[PDB]
Swiss-Prot record:
Cellular-component GO terms for this entry: extracellular region
Protein name: Trypsin inhibitor 2
Domain notes: The presence of a 'disulfide through disulfide knot' structurally defines this protein as a knottin.
UniProt organism field: Momordica cochinchinensis (Spiny bitter cucumber)
UniProt record similarity statement: Belongs to the protease inhibitor I7 (squash-type serine protease inhibitor) family.
Post-translational modification (record): A cyclic succinimide probably forms by loss of water between Asp-4 and Gly-5, that can then rehydrate to either the original peptide bond or to a beta-aspartyl isopeptide bond. Three isoforms of MCoTI-II are detected, two with the parent molecular weight, corresponding to the unmodified and proposed isopeptide forms, and one with a molecular weight 18 Da lower, corresponding to a succinimide cross-linked form. This is a cyclic peptide.
GO biological process: defense response; negative regulation of serine-type endopeptidase activity
Taxonomy, superkingdom: Eukaryota
UniProt crosslink position ((2-aminosuccinimidyl)acetic acid (Asp-Gly)): D4-G5
């Protein structure tokens, strides 16, 4: 979850790229949603 579009619920779902996460989420450096 970030800002100005970066909005995400709980993060515990892996992500390859930012849009790999469901919702308006992005991807953290830990290899999971943000």
């Amino acid at each position: 979850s970030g800002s100005d579009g970066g909005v995400c619920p709980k993060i515990l779902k892996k992500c390859r790229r930012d849009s790999d996460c469901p919702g308006a989420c992005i991807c953290r450096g830990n290899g999971y949603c943000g």
